[PDB]
């Protein structure tokens, strides 16, 4: 389907093409703009990688967490998310709750979890 | 010993200096250095992205579940690791490098991660 070809696909079907989009995140007048474009692409790629690192998701495109889903973020069932919705619609639905989820992923795992692994690997 | 010191060594002996080469990939006269620094970063990140999408993030030696095809090279291990250098190997299989990379992307991430995604429930 190529880059963003799954944009109109359901979230489930679109989740099997994650590498297609991942491969396209890195790659006087017209000289300066080219360098700025290169630096911006690198900074945004790394911002996403930094967040994956903080959440304990480094090196993975699909990462499972220890943060439960709060029904106030969305009360839809799985058949109404993965089978009957696209990722653009989902992003529209989860907007006000993105920072809450990110804060919980940062606090509830890879921080408390790493201290717990630090203690478990102690014995 | 040292950066690229093992370049003339066999693949086996040369596999012991991966950090020696890896640690030297990140580190008029004003804009040339800025472009040189950006280029070093972009090349580094493209290689790290490939390692990531293959499930090899954070590793210098990464084992996979992709079987070796005798059509890529029919040499045994003795003639690859003990009687060959990495420059010779790179030359010998350059025609198959992208095939291998495609297989690594398909089976070492897309299939494996969905299988792990399912094993975390059952």
């Amino acid at each position, epitope marked *: 389907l190529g880059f963003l070809g799954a944009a109109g696909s359901t979230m489930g079907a679109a989740s099997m093409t994650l590498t297609v989009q991942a491969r396209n995140l890195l790659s006087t007048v017209w000289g300066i703009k080219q360098l700025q474009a290169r630096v911006l692409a690198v900074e945004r790629y790394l911002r996403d990688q930094q967040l994956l690192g903080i959440w304990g998701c480094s090196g993975k495109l699909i990462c499972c967490t220890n943060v439960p889903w709060n029904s106030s973020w969305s009360n839809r069932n799985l*058949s109404e998310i*993965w089978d009957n919705m696209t990722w653009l619609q989902w992003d529209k639905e989860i907007s006000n709750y993105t920072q809450i989820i990110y804060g919980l992923l940062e606090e509830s795992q890879n921080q408390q979890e790493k201290n717990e692994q630090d203690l478990l690997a102690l014995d | 010993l040292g950066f690229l010191g093992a370049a003339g060594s066999t693949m086996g002996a040369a596999s012991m200096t991966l950090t020696v080469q890896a640690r030297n990939l990140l580190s008029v006269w004003g804009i040339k250095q800025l472009q040189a620094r950006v280029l070093a970063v972009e090349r580094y990140l493209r290689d790290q992205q490939l390692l990531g999408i293959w499930g090899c993030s954070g590793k210098l030696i990464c084992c996979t579940n992709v079987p070796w095809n005798s059509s890529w090279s029919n040499r045994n291990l003795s003639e690859i690791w003990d009687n060959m250098t990495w420059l010779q190997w790179d030359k010998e299989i350059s025609n198959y490098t992208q095939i291998i990379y495609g297989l690594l992307e398909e089976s070492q991430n897309q299939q494996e991660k969905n*299988e792990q*995604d*399912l094993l975390a*429930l*059952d």
Partner: antibody
Amino acid sequence: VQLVETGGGLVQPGGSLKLSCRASGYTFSSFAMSWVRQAPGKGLEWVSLINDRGGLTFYVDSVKGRFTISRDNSKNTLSLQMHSLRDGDTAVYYCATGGMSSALQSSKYYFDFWGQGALVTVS
Amino acid sequence: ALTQPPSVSGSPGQSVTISCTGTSSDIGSYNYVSWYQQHPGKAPKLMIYDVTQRPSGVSDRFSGSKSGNTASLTISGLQADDEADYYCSAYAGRQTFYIFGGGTRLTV
């Protein structure tokens, strides 16, 4: 939904049989499949489970090193290869649908479709 | 295996209960205790799934429940066509997946 086993039914001890099952009336690739065995005078026993894609297979300990469960989603066919059949393996084998779901589906920890179990005698 | 009482009986129109007792890991840990009705010579049909859920096409007379480590299938308005071997099936975990009970004949 229609599920029909097309496997054999008589083997000597120590021999090997392969039981195929055809399915129709639903999308085959959307459901996990299981084999459940019922000895002539006993109740039901779970034998094996394969996911919807076919990459994950699970077995009951009594057959874990002898049976192989596999699925071809292009031909809508499930099969169970049983090597070194024991006298204790005489039973009706049902190619039941269900037993697990993907992380993007509701949890199907039940067998919702059954049909025409093959009777296998070891003797 | 799970334990079920054999030979549950009753007369037409009365309700009956078929119990299924398991351990802490089979029934008490998960709400996945399905029930099947198997007539002689036929494959089992699913009657109850999860604990209290019923497949479409299954009459309201079949209603599951759980208490503690014991699951129960209540069949109200018992009919003469309900004579079958009933089985409970519990999900135990990823090491041992499903545990079945013996059969309970509903002797109507």
